[PDB]
A paper describes a structure:
Herein, we report the first structural and kinetic characterization of a novel alkyl diamine N-hydroxylase DesB from Streptomyces sviceus (SsDesB). This enzyme catalyzes the first committed step in the biosynthesis of desferrioxamine B, a clinical drug used to treat iron overload disorders.
In the SsDesB-FAD complex structure, the FAD molecule is bound in an elongated conformation with the fully planar isoalloxazine ring positioned at the interface of the two dinucleotide-binding domains and a large area of the molecule, particularly the adenine dinucleotide portion, is exposed to solvent. In the holoenzyme, FAD is held in the active site pocket primarily by hydrogen bonding interactions involving S43, E42, K44, H50, P390, and W49 along the flavin adenine nucleotide backbone while residues Q61 and L392 contribute direct hydrogen bonds to the planar isoalloxazine ring primarily via the backbone amide nitrogen atoms. For our crystallization efforts, we used concentrated protein eluted from an IMAC column in which the aliquots retained a deep yellow color. However, similar crystallization hits could also be obtained after adding exogenous FAD to the protein aliquots after passage through a size exclusion column and then concentrating the protein. The fit of the FAD molecule to the final 2Fo-Fc electron density map (blue mesh, 2.86 Å resolution, contoured at 1σ level) is shown. The SsDesB active site appears to be more solvent exposed, which may contribute to its uncoupled mechanism as a lower amount of FAD copurified with the enzyme compared to that of other N-hydroxylases (75% flavin in NbtG and 50–60% flavin in SidA) in which FAD is buried and inaccessible by solvent.
Numbering used by the authors:
A (entry chain D), C (entry chain C): 12 to 425
B (entry chain B), D (entry chain A): 10 to 425
The structure:
């Protein structure tokens, strides 16, 4: 093949839809799951995308693509009432249903296929499957995603504690407890906190929301800042000193630790409403580390330290929801071709401006996992079509889908 | 040489039909337009003015989102899609929509600008239309998209001076602001947009600003989502099947469609009035329930006699400027005179246009785009249903549904 | 006494706090309930007023009076909380709790006292209890309110059907059924429909909403039509021919049949959300009168006629909620004084511009129940302070609280 | 004449104290103000401008809603309460709040206008204060409400030409728009208000418009409700008891406080750039991460040397007009020199303001309004506080809590 995509969607899925009309390119994608499924553990009732529907799979690169969210609604017979709904943001299960509708309309996807290991023979890349099948191509696109992150204070933890990755499946058991505690900030943490707080006077549990963030940061979604999600900002950002880039990565607040401002205010309105009937058994703590964690009987003892104040405190809770983020890890299957991959000074891929990670500037491409190289655009649905069109532009020698070089009104470079 | 159909007039409705029929090789008719190029209501291109419907109400999207004439594709070609994505506004600006349609119009090859239709005949089972210049086109079908010309009350017919209908406001604005008195007659979106524009500079020119309307209130555009479901195929079929007397009642009772103002515009008009009033009394005047009964010019000044209808009292205003935002009205063009016997009429002498949007004896020969409120209610002049109607028209020009045409879209049931 | 207030709704309770600091005025108020209680039974969680908080008991006539809503929050220790909430509309239970707080701080209210008879002897009005006690004064202020209305077609039906006046207390039984129907439109009708919907997939019921109105009318509170809730419009409106005012009263819809537009929108948004999981067992019907209703088994058979189309249809549902309006009926306790009261051509009170209903034009005052003479302003909480200060103006002969003559930017009279 | 306290300066904070002290018989101080009458930041009275805090942040309400000096009472007396009720806007206009403040000061008798305090020393267990006229006022307590004068970067000290600080924009606007080039330095609400004002008329005057700021982003004002709980008594109880190094650190990192823009204003700026750009390229530049390090004037034009700090590159801009929106900063007034021995300072040389808002040896003799970010965080220059701060000051002047003082208002816990 020309290329082989490992892991499908929503970034590699978008590439599948973008190359299907290109006959000059024949690539194939292998996904481990039996069918496409997004973050199904966060499918709370009413939950919606944090980016408008134009950040779908194709539209930002080609609004005429047959796999656009608008065309999907037209086929489902739902376009007109969506027109009446007049909401830029699709609901989460609506988006999950849309990409599954797109994946099943393609012919170049092989589900139930977990790649085992990769290496490099005869200037081609060989990829091995769990079943034993082996594909080969000159290029590979890595869209394996970002596994959930667990703090080391919860390594080797036992009990029924969950990452927010699997909340919907275990809300069954959480509401039956006497006390629930959520660790970390971010959209998922607040969505879960609002969901539990909404029924706190029916199940009767205590509700704790602890985070080390100094504030409950709002998502940085004012339009002048949204212009940093731009081709010309990546051009600027990428040629900065890598330590200043790793500092901008570490300092960034709203990207992974940011809550929708509306959700923040709805949480306050709900706290106000419940507090009319009497004292609400809830706690919201900031500037608080999670240092220790142990399981006894069927309750957890968590040791926190208020870093700013310089004092420790412990809380006990039978339920434990780790709304900690996600973190990319070197996949095991790229061990035999590590010396073809280029690394930075800190131990991760130094992804090039053209989203390549190997000795040739156009060999293996990397979707996501590039905040230290492309900042907030790396895990953004709104920049999936842009990154895929540049990966296309390197697989051919041509620009099949036009690639904008300036979108913003402001200048980031000089 | 005889075509399948001839489109007379190139407004947003016929232009959308042109964009929807271009990928159909089984069809190919021709479009005749008076203007040298596509031009919308340019006399209302006020700074910041925008559409009353979301951008999906473009020429094609609601029938085919993959169409190359989408508004989104237009933004992609001009290098503006990502900035529009950040703008996060469903409503394109008026000049933005005007440039988009002109961009789509010059992408087509089926449009004849600068030709006005003079005659329409029926001969040899075909329709024969002639140009001012004498050019003659023939086709089996006709699609009339002539729009609705501006309406002028009879109290203003044959009136002297420099008074304007709101359709020419931008061209005469620099001369209006020089006057010491300006009066706006009628309600609706355009009247409020003009009032807000003049009120915003009332402090630098020093004119009086009068806004008089016959409607009992400043109606809002009825744009709540359950009422939006009345803009459905379900409601049209319900509505079309009811007695004609009940149909003509409900269009007369229609408030928000032609005489409605965007609620947000109403509230910033009030906010602006609150703002200006802090510095002292502002020379403005907002009157309701007032009909314009007579008007006369003298001294470069107008004397307009009004009657408060429900209070039963008369009064009149003296103003140097006069802006008539009295809306528009369809008049049957005389070029249809040679085939009037071929057309369907109702009790009050208007077109009894079918559910398939047909106005002739065949029920499928001559189609009519706008000017059908008494038959399809608020659907007729709505950009959000231009792709639906064009889909129905294409369905009968062909023998097949080229684009899918929805059966039901709402959660309500209007019939039983 | 100088006046006797019959009934302690928001209007008469407002008059009670506006007259407390006036020493030259000694009035007293008789309420049937043992304490103040607003429209409980519509106290849905999150429900709120339809007018901003300065439409309380005093502020629009005297922002300095100690019975303000803001002073109430200051004493409860909730002002800064309310300040951050930045919402103009208080919650229903919050307003109800506030009015009771003001009522109990007063000296002039006698709870648990139902008035049985009014009479007039030697130029005084004699008011007698059902307990047997007797009060008499020179003036009367009737704040009886407007009791629920039921469309006669449901007179003397068996079952368990309710008026929306009793929704909260019967909700636990309503959800048990498999079919619920709501008749009539308006704010609470939609407040109930949106409450039953949203849990339509946890219980098993079908949900029917049937109204006679042609639209789901929005409570249109655009600021220029809100200027019709002004003294100058009442001066205009009252001096109209009463045939025209009876036409205006009947033909405009929205005052009692209007829904909050944002409530309409989330009703649609919720319908859109539920419909993703499959067809929703709900029906929204317009233009349809309720002509007949029966009850055999635990099921209602209701005969409807869609008057616009001219066709009949019936609906069988175990549950029946009558969200119809409220209607004023002249109380029987004013029978011995009936010939001292003024009536119009249609047989109801010809209320003066000064809100009087008797021959003197300044002896008996009537709160509410004056739409045919004062239009939008009579059942409006925002005009309760205006009307009360005009009542105080006639009792004292002087304007204790300033009474605005004009407030709007437009002119209604010419 | 020996009073209880003498209040120096009459801004919103000391005026609020004047309104909360008038109904207190046990207290009678006196207020000295340089200006002939109250006047707020008039140099930023752009049309439509409004407060950043709701109207309850007036002079009294958050301490006593029944006060006769409340904003709502002011509207009632002015005959404007009902349409403000219809306006349904939490935020008074700047000109509205300014008129409201003069209306309250005129109603009091404790204010001396046109008096400038020149010297304060400590004699006979009393504070003496001397005015420019030479009049003497004596009291044991002082309340310092002199505000914060404008700040000018050292690159602009001794600069020639007609450059202005943003605090005088209204008076210089008519001459700025005449120029060919205007450049705005710094970010924040005022900087963005000025940029939007000039950008709105960029195609009528034809100037180039430059907006240069050192901040890496265009920060929105941190006004989400969970953050707004940080301006609370319990937070500054927690904040004040922190190590001074940590306090000065968090004061320095503060973004939205003085360098934050209203998010709605950011969005309407982008929308306005989108609207103007339709008509062609708009001659304006928005630069960030840029520090101004040198400036000079030659023949009516400024040449400004900037450094993109993050990128590590230099660049220069030439502009005829220079607007410095560089904020404000407190400086110890020279009239406190003879009493410097009695004032408490911290390690970096600033007032070690008590949590009771005192700055003197006795912890209750001299009180400081504003200029206390390093000890009271976002609360010190906030109109939402100041009512709270005045009640605490009155509680130290008296021995009793005259107005209730909240100790907890938030749902979240800041301390452990
Ligand atoms: C709840 C939630 C909501 C979000 N919402 C948004 C939003 O609105 N907008 C936005 O821009 N971002 C959003 N994000 C962030 C980000 O865009 C999403 O996480 C996105 O789904 C990640 O896309 P991805 O393709 O890079 O990774 P993934 O979606 O995680 O794709 C990884 C895929 O690779 C497969 N895989 C794993 N191992 C192998 C293997 N060995 N071989 C083959 N396949 C393998 C996995 O099964 C999976 O299907 C959200 C994140 C979360 C958690
Ligand atoms: C300012 C304004 C804003 C509006 N905004 C909206 C909105 O946001 N949404 C909405 O749904 N509706 C809107 N409307 C209402 C409606 O959509 C418009 O009236 C719309 O432009 C109607 O287009 P049309 O195709 O019916 O005809 P028109 O736009 O009126 O065009 C008819 C064309 O036919 C040509 N023509 C006439 N006679 C002949 C002839 N004999 N031969 C050849 N050509 C001829 C004319 O020159 C003209 O170009 C708006 C109306 C106005 C006035
Ligand atoms: C659910 C609901 C919400 C509303 N929300 C708003 C809103 O947001 N804004 C607005 O402007 N309007 C609103 N209204 C309309 C109007 O403000 C209310 O109807 C209002 O409560 C009317 O109060 P009232 O003083 O007329 O008497 P009511 O509140 O109706 O009650 C009068 C009192 O008189 C007592 N009484 C009756 N008979 C006797 C007797 N014989 N002797 C002694 N006492 C007696 C009753 O016990 C009762 O306590 C709402 C109405 C309803 C039903
Ligand atoms: C344009 C602008 C808008 C703002 N908007 C808000 C807002 O919406 N909300 C908010 O919370 N904060 C706002 N602020 C911040 C802050 O609340 C205001 O700056 C506020 O005016 C500060 O109050 P102050 O009394 O301490 O200062 P000032 O109002 O500046 O008080 C200084 C006064 O003291 C007088 N004075 C000084 N020295 C002497 C002396 N020696 N003798 C006599 N008199 C003297 C001066 O003449 C002047 O009248 C804004 C600031 C600015 C610049």
């Amino acid at each position: 093949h020309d290329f082989v995509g490992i892991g499908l969607g929503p970034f590699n899925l978008g590439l599948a839809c973008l190359t299907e009309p290109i006959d000059e390119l024949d690539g194939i994608f292998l996904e481990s799951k039996p069918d496409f499924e997004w973050h199904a553990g966060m499918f709370l009732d009413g939950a919606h995308l944090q980016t408008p529907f134009m950040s779908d799979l194709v539209t930002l690169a080609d609004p005429t693509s047959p796999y656009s969210f608008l065309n999907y609604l037209k086929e489902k017979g739902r376009l007109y009432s969506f027109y009446i709904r007049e909401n830029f943001y699709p609901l989460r299960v609506e988006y999950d249903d849309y990409c599954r509708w797109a994946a099943n309309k393609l012919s170049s996807i092989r589900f139930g296929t977990t790649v085992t290991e990769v290496r490099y023979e005869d200037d081609l890349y060989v990829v091995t499957t769990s079943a034993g099948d082996v594909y080969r191509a000159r290029h590979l696109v890595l869209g394996t995603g970002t596994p959930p992150y667990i703090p080391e204070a919860c390594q080797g933890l036992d009990g029924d504690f969950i990452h927010n990755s699997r909340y919907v499946q275990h809300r069954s058991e959480l509401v039956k407890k006497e006390s629930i505690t959520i660790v970390g900030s971010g959209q998922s943490a607040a969505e879960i906190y609002q969901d539990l707080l909404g029924e706190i006077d029916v199940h009767g549990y205590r509700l704790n929301w602890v985070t080390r963030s100094p504030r409950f940061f709002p998502l940085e979604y004012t339009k002048l800042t949204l212009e940093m999600t731009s081709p010309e900002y990546i051009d600027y950002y990428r040629e900065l000193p890598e330590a200043t880039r790793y500092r901008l990565t570490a300092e960034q607040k709203g990207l992974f630790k940011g809550i929708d401002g509306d959700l923040i205010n709805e949480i306050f309105d709900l706290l106000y409403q419940k507090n009319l009937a009497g004292p609400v058994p809830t706690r919201l703590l900031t500037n608080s580390s999670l240092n220790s964690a142990r399981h006894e009987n069927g309750t957890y003892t968590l040791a926190f330290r208020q870093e700013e104040q310089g004092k420790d405190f412990e809380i006990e809770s039978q339920g434990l929801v780790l709304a900690t983020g996600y973190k990319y890890a070197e996949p095991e299957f790229l061990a035999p071709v590590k010396d073809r991959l280029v690394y930075d000074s800190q131990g991760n891929f130094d992804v090039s401006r053209a989203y390549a990670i190997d000795v040739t500037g156009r060999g293996v491409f990397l979707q996501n996992a590039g905040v230290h190289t492309h900042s907030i655009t790396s895990p953004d649905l709104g920049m999936g079509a842009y990154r895929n069109s540049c990966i296309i532009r390197e697989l051919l020698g041509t620009e099949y889908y036009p690639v904008e070089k300036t979108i913003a009104f402001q200048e980031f470079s000089v």
